[PDB]
UniProtKB/Swiss-Prot annotation:
Disruption phenotype: No visible phenotype. Hippocampus slices from mutant mice show minor differences in the amplitude of miniature inhibitory postsynaptic currents, and somewhat slower decay times. Detected in brain, especially in hippocampus and cerebellum (at protein level). This is Muskelin. Disulfide bonds: none annotated. The LisH domain contains a nuclear targeting signal. The LisH domain mediates head to tail dimerization. Coiled coil: none annotated. The lineage of its organism: Eukaryota, Metazoa, Chordata, Craniata, Vertebrata.
Amino acid sequence: ECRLLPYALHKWSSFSSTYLPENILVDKPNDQSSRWSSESNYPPQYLILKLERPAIVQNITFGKYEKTHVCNLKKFKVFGGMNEENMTELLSSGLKNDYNKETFTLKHKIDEQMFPCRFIKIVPLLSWGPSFNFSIWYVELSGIDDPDIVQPCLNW
């Protein structure tokens, strides 16, 4: 019932030259350059993704480089909402510093009632090694954008 939910890069705190936010759309673990890197690790740093359609966002998947990297996210949070200026926390966790893709379930209900988002904000908080930057290699979102399921979850 869960499918891949396409998104665009909407806003970002910063990026280091040539390490552009849109590099997270591409899964190329043999390419050191295929990542967003923040300009610095001073907070707040973030990427905001806009889904093509509102969805019940149920999972986020992070890709990796082919080898361990100091810039990998040891700690991060994910927030989401229908409104890009008003979001709730969906996940607080970290990545393993390895070459293995990881998928995390996201909080998408309140009291057993599913809620939709149009925007997802990823907030890197701590890198694995001494670094001056945070990096994200690849992001997939998955969930439900079927209007027959999403629309009854939307406030009137």
